[PDB]
Structures are given as structure tokens and as C-alpha cells.
Amino acid sequence: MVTIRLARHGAKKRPFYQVVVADSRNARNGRFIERVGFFNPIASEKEEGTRLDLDRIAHWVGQGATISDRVAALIKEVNKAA
Amino acid sequence: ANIKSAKKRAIQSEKARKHNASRRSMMRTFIKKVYAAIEAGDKAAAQKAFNEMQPIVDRQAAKGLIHKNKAARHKANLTAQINKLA
Amino acid sequence: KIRTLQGRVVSDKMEKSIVVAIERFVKHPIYGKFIKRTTKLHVHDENNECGIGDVVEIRECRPLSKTKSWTLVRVVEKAV
Amino acid sequence: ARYLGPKLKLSRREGTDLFLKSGVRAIDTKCKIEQAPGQHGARKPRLSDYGVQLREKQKVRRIYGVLERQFRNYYKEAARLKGNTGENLLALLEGRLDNVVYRMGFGATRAEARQLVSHKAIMVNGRVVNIASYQVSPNDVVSIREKAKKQSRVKAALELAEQREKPTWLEVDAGKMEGTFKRKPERSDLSADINEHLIVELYSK
RNA sequence: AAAUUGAAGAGUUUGAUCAUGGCUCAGAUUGAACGCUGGCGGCAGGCCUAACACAUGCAAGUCGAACGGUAACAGGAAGAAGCUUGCUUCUUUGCUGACGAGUGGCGGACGGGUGAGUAAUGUCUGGGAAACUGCCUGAUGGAGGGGGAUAACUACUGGAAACGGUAGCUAAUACCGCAUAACGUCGCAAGACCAAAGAGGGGGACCUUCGGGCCUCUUGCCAUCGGAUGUGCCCAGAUGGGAUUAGCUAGUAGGUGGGGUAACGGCUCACCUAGGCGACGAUCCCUAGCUGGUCUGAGAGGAUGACCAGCCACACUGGAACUGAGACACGGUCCAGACUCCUACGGGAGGCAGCAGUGGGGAAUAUUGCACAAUGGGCGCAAGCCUGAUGCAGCCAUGCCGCGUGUAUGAAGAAGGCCUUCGGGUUGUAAAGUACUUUCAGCGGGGAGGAAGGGAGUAAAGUUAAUACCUUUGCUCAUUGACGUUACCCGCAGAAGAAGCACCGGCUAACUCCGUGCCAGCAGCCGCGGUAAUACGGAGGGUGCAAGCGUUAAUCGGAAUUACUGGGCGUAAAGCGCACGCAGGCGGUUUGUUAAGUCAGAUGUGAAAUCCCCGGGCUCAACCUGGGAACUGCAUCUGAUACUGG
User: Where is this region: Disordered (chain B)?
Assistant: First the structure.
């Protein structure tokens, strides 16, 4: 099925996660359908560090896609503060 | 086979092969009877065979063993040829 | 609103079937000169109607044989 | 990663003052500045066109402390930028920390100022920077930290900065031991004995 | 606002000259290797050869909330009795916590590897019509009622093992009918025909064959039409070399009708027609996985396809199917073949181009490491279990980037070396000496972030016959890190522990002694060496790079030396011995029309990464990252009509 998940990138011990509407069979860093936002867990906290696209995630959940554990938490947390 | 899953799954598939083979042979045999009655030149024998074939191939589509569209080709193809006689 | 090529009719020995050269003027990639490069096509003609030499017009439908996926919309010029 | 040798062999090969000993003692007492270094110095050469381009690059390199692999990289950058590629290349050497230290006059030489920098005596904007090639920006403060106000080196060095010329592009505030790199220096602000067209010609063969 | 600012020559033919023209050099790059040398860290990279053969361990399971169940080890119960009245040793019991083997489900078609085959059942770009699609999702309805089996288990039994054979035994969401049936399929219509499966948590009443029924919530099951994803199929263009390969093709090319496929189709077959492809390179031979990209270049070009990402193909060699939403299946089946082992000689077993690793080949390429803590994946209501994917560590200067190996001062300028016109000169402020600093390494102390969640508790709202239960939302408490003795920060001691390699005739930056005597040797090209060698070998000095420096190999450059941009052909290489002439290329002048080329505008696409610009984050840098520009292309639509074409 179609999912919404984090692909890892970044250097070693300093990850960085793109957020990617994939088919679930494809490998983590491989073939995605869309990119939708990002997530930096090492961020400075004076300067962004997470940005989802809530308008295009809600579209893909419409058409009937899953979400991860993490991408769920990131949606909960980017609707509290913003 | 090394893996447990693979040993088992080879047994299951040899069971299903023997099963499916029987259901596939049956389903053909009823279809052969209609082509026998068509080659005789024989409208109401062939129409009687078509009505014994019909419920079998529609079921075998639902059970999985053929596809919906193979079922329909077999009906369409005979229905055409019995209407050329009568 | 259909994509529709034009051409002309370099055989018609086949039954319900013709062969139809499409010309086009391509710039050569290196040397800059515009060139006649030809594109032959087997085409479905119902009614055996189209003569050899005849200008014609054709569209892409489903596959009809091994070769043909192209069927004959209308004739333009002819008998020449 | 650093020239460890005799500093006045270098100054004789250029025929020039490269500022590599401070000026407690003046230059012409120590060495022989007119005569070139080693055994066959007093004999002139007809120095070729490649020669004079090489000789000029190695003057600039040996002032600022930089080695070739690193200098070549400054040159790539300087060309990448928009501007005269000579003027840009000298901006990027007057940006370097170990130099900016010395031009504010906490070091006596660039080799001293580089030992400050490496030994964690320098902050930039509060944070301890300890690498010589750090590129200072406009409106950064550089400043000494609190062990290293109590050194004899730094006080005696600030005496020697009053006898040299004043840089325009730094505001030093020498009682505190800090100062503000205000803007990038222009070509007019720097020494005009350095030909830069020779270096650029060199690499674009 | 910005998104490209870009182009060097020299040596060698001659007594000398100008020209032609080859050879050679100076640059960048690398999955490199070899030699000499070697302090630290960061980020990358690492069998290019034999798609050779492999010992050993691990790389795919999970589910008791589908089922019959007990062999384990946890309790509990009746109950032998430790009996010292409750501290429990030993006999039962599937009673419940669980759970080996078995049935059944879902997954083993993903993820991981490799590039042998494949010049087109491939790839890239753009179009299209005749298709299927488990898991996820929207809508619409259904879910009634019966049957016969068989693994396990039991009893006997064959075989050295692998693995089996008899006779009974029993279950389900296993399997099969019947009922049921439309917006489903067949049909012009009338009509004909097609399915299903239950399991869980709790419960106020009320009945019982004390099993449950019954109420309710969660969850699955079946059909139909949608959506999303994934896949299949077709067409046009583009996608290496060879003409000392020019004719190839009879299921061949088209038709009609049958059969086949999820689907169009010579896909297959019977009859009929005699076509189809080709100098715009068919056929045949050689080489090769394709692309995004990478290297080089001022650019146009040329070379390349390692890592990362997309597509293809293969899984000891060849052949074939089966199961299934999906395979003609790396860790499945059957067959043949070669190889390797076991055998009581009847027969059996295996497949690292998963991760480590061994041998072999080779100039040459690593540990039989830790962890699922994070991100993904499978199964599961969940807890959780699995995951050599992945995340980390190890080895190696293989590469890029950063830092270090001290700093300042110090003279008749010590010694020793070297040269000397024997005055002195040079090594050289170099050392010693005197002041100061302690980065990194070494020894101590502190210490972020990667962790989001899940659990145990309450609180409210929903839910409903119910304050049960379940779900959603907030609250409180105890927790989850492989790396790791982590990054980062502070303290201690003392210049302490840390510099080599190539070159010095010209091209090309850097020169003198002694040895040697066309010998030994050097050498990229010219050439050097035959007793005063700036060219050999050693010494002293110097130049250039610097934890690296050189040699070799390979690509582009320089090379306007295959010239589109951008060359030539009277004598330097180069005008067919001369004509005619088919395909081909090119075509005077004028008006109209068309709008193919051409130009302008708009939409769609041109994956992400890469490159370039403006920013941000690692102390800086490499490295990572936000936004843009670019992807010069292809298609569609609307205009323009000078030029070319019709």
C-alpha cells in the first residue's frame, strides 16, 4: 500500500529525514511518489527543524494512505505550535 | 528446502495442485460436451449441455480457479455457435 | 481533437492493407543541415480503396496485426 | 602543514621584507637582505616569465602562511565569486583569522598570531575558534579570553602595533583586548608592491 | 537581486630560413597499483580479475483473538500426604499463563546481491487502448441452512539414512453442495447463472440440554461499482563497431474463420492471397547491461556508466511448470547435465552473484565485530517476536578537507660540514643560550543530542440497556541508547611524544666540488658520458610539494593533428584518365493560397540526488541541508507568414 514515512539522509550520526509518500514495498531511500516535507532531529532550535505539507498529506490520507508512527507524531506536534 | 516455511509451503501447493487439477479437468469436460453437440449439428442437445456447463464455470470463477473474463469468453463463444445452428 | 499524420501510399498489394511513407524534415544533430528522413507504416484500409501513389491520412488505433496499429482516416489526393 | 624553517632565507629569495620577524630589531642588522640565500646568491639570473609569476605567488603564500593545496582552493573560490579575481583573492587572505589577529596587533608576527589561534586564546563572537583559516565576516568581534589577557606576549605585541601603520577596516579597542572586523578591505587598503595579475596568469596556464 | 567571468604554449628536420607535418612535454582526473616515508582527526570509499570453487555460523518469519491440542515449564485445584498445621515432597488434572510438533492464515514475488546474457519480448523521451491489481481506502448491499474428509494423535510396521507403509481416530476462518442474487456475467430481448466465516472483551434483566441463548462494542467474511498504488500491452523518435558482411524472410506479410490470453495481436491453427524487409544499411559477424549521471573541455565536442538513485536481466548449467493478487521463484518444486560429499551399495544430500569468511586467480581491494536504541519491512487486536535491510564499530594515507610537529628573542656570525681567486664565503638567527605558549597525542574529572513513543495509573467526553468493555483526548508516575570510556567542556605535566619525497642541461622553479673516463650509468623528447661532466655516482648547497612525495597505467586536454563551431587538395598528403547519367543534394522571377520547416506565446511533462545561484547547520573546511535557477528536450493548443517547402 501507499504510506507516508521518513527516509533517512544526512551524514553519519547526524541524520536528516525527508518525508515521502511511497509505496510500502520500495526500499526506505528508494522510489517515492511525492516528497511532502522534512524533519531535522539535530536542529539548532533557533532555525526551522521541521516542515510538513499538511495540505498534501491530508490529500494522500484522503485517497487512502497510511502514516508511520513518527509522521503521525510530527503531525500532532506541528498542529500544536503552529 | 532449508526453511520450515518452505517445506510446509511445498506440501500445501502439492495439495492444491491435485485439487485444482480435478476442478480444471471437470470444467473442461463440460465445455467439451458442448463442442461435441455443436459438431453433431444438434441444437437442443447442445443447448442442454450449455445449461449444465454454465453453472460450473461461473462457480469456478468465484472460487478463483479461473478468471471472471475466461468464464465470459467460454459462454460468449458457445452462445454464438449454438445460435448459428438454432 | 485527434493526433493524425498524413503521408503517401508506397504499396497496396496486401488485402485490406497498405504501406504509407511519412516524410519529415529533421535538423541533423551535429552538422545543422535539414534532412528528409522517412517513416514507413503498415496501415489498415477497409474496402481496398486507396491506390498506389495516393496521398492519405492515418491515425493510431489498437493493434490489428503483427505490424499494423494505424488505420486510414480519409484520402486527400489520388489517381495521379 | 607549516613552514618550520629559517625565516630569512625566505626574505632573501624574494628580495623583500615579508614581516616574518617582528621589529624589536630592524631587518638589515640580522641577515644579508640584498644577497640571495645559500652559496650561489651573489650571481644574478635572467629570471624567466614563468619564474616571475612563480616568484610572486610564493611571496604572497609566504606572507600569509598558506600552502599550495590550500592556496589553489582559495584561487578556485576567488574565481567562482563575482568581482576582479585578484582583488577577491586578497580579500580571502585578509579574511583569515591568524592574519586578522596580527593586523589588530595581538600577534607580533603571523606565526605568533597563529599560535594564539591554535592554542584557544581567541574567541570570535563569544565562541572559541581555534583554527587559523577561519574566515571572519563583517561585524564580527574578535577578542582574547581570560587566561590570555595575562600573557606578556600580547601586551608587548600591542606596543609594536602602535609603530606599524593603522588598518582602516578594523576598529581595535586595545585596553579590553578586542576589536571589530568592520568591512572587507579594498585593494587600496593593502600593500601595492604585491602584483596579483601574476598569480592569476599563473593558474590559468 | 543572483543562477556561469571564458580560450597561454614549448622542444625536436636546416649551414641558416620560412612553411608543411609527425613525435614529445607542461594540466586536470582515478574504485587505482608499485616505491620511499608516515603524528592526529573529520566525511567518504574499498575483488575493476575467476558469472572460479567453497569448510563454518548467521541473512524470513510470524499468528493460540482460525483450529484439534498437550511435549515442554509456569502456576493453580481435587487429592496421595512432606506431615515440623500449613514452610509444602509426590500423584493426577489443558483448569489458565503459555506453548514443541501438526492443520489453517498472511508473509517467503519485498528487502539484499551480481552484471554473465541481451544491439532489442532492453533502455531513454513522448504518445496511446484492448487490460488485470493481495494489502490500504470510498460507496452500496449481503452474511440463511446442511454435508463428507484428513494431518496431528493411537496401534503395528519397512529403511543404514533421507524418507516412508498399513489399519483405525478427530477439528476449523481447511474443503463441497443446497438455499439466496443484482447497478454482476452470458444474451437483441425474453430469460438463464454466480458467494459467504466466524473469532474475541464485558454484561443489567430473562430462560436453559448450566453448555449457553440474548444485548452491545471491536474485529474479520462475500458480492458489485469507484479511488489509490503496482503491473502488463502497443506505436513514433533516440539508443556502439564493421560493406574485405548485399540480398534476407514461407507463421514469413496480410486476409477469413476457429482456438487461446487478464488484455490487443500469427499469440496458435486450418483454409486463402503472394506478400514483407532493405543502400534512410536489411541479413550476418564483433563488442556491450540502459539511464539520471561522472571525468575532460572556453565552448561545440570527446571519454565513461565505480559509489548514490530509476529501469532491465540472471541466481551451479540447460529445460519446465506448479502454488498464488503477483514468480515461470537466490536461501521453493520436478527433470536432465557437470561438480562435491554421505552410503550397510539398495540409494541419498548440496548450490555465498545475502553478511562475515576460506582457497584460487590476480599489479590490487577489509572483521568468521556490536545492536535492533533510531528509520523502514513482515506477521500479530496488542504486548511482542523476526529483520547480516539498516544503524554503528573494525581494518587500510585509497581519496577529499582541517589541524599539528612550537612561539618570540638570540652574533662577529661557535663548532663541525662544504667551497675558496686561502682575504674569506656559505650552511645561518639556523643551532646553543634567554624568555614564553600547550592546540593535537598521553594521564585525570564532568557531559549534551540522536527518544518519537510504548507501558502502569487515574480524568473527561463519546459508546451503549449499562458508571461494563472498548475507542478518542489530556493528566501523573517508573521507564526504553548498539554506538559509548560519545560529541563538547574543564584540569595536570613538560618543547616535551610528531618530516619526508622528488627535483636542480633545456622545455622547467633550483649549482658547485670530488670520483668516473663512450666504462659504469642517465634518459619523457632533444640528447649526456671518449680525464677539467652544472646531464652518470657521491657530497655540500638550492627549488618544489609537504603527512605525504614520486614512478607506472588509464581518459580528456594541449592537437585548428578528422577542423559542426574550426583544416585542406598547382609543387608539401590530397582533383577520379574523360564523359553520360538514375537515386540524392541544390534551384531564376511574379501574384495568390497552404502553414510542413521556421518564429512567438500558453499548458503538460522532462523522478529525486548531481551541477550552478542565494541562504542555513556542523568551531572552519570537506560533509549535510532550505529555497530557487537549470534540465538547451518532446508533445499538445493558439497566433505570425519574411525566408525555405507544398
Answer: 1-25
Name the DSSP letter for residue D96: B
Residue numbers of the domain that contains A32:
1-81
Rounded to whole angstroms, how far apart are CA atoms A60 and A3? 9
Query: CB-based burial of residue D114 (10 Å sphere; 0-12 exposed, 13-18 middle, 19+ buried)?
Result: buried
Q: Are D40 and D46 in contact (CB under 8 A)?
A: no
- Give the total number of structural domains in chain A: 1
Which residues on neighbouring strands pair with residue A35, listed in sequence order? A20
The sign of the dihedral angle between the CA atoms of D68, D69, D70, D75 is: positive
Give residue limits of the domains in chain C: 1-80
Return the biggest CA–CA distance within chain D: 54
CA distances from D40 to D6, D32, D36, D37, D62 (A): 18, 14, 8, 8, 22
What domains are there in chain D, each with its CATH number?
7-93+190-203 (1.10.1050.10), 94-181 (3.10.290.10)
| Residue/partner pairs of B9-15 with CB below 8 Å, 24 or more apart | none
Residues 6+ apart with CB under 8 A from B59: none
Is residue C51 within 8 Å of C71, Cβ to Cβ?
Answer: no
Reference D143, options D117, D168, D119; nearest CA is D117
For chain B, counts of helices (H) and of strands (E): 3, 0
Residue A64 corresponds to which cell in the numbers above?
Answer: 487512502
The CA distance from B49 to B32, in Å, is: 9
Q: Which nucleotides of E are covered by protein (CB under 7 A)?
A: 5-8, 26, 39, 42-44, 60-62, 101-108, 110-112, 127-132, 134-138, 175-178, 184-187, 192-196, 222-224, 226-230, 233-238, 253-256, 258-267, 273-278, 280, 301-302, 308-311, 322-325, 329, 331-333, 350-351, 374-378, 389-393, 401-411, 413, 425-430, 435-439, 449-454, 474, 483, 489-490, 499, 507-512, 540-547, 549, 564, 584-586, 596-598, 607-608, 612-614, 616-621, 623-626, 635-637
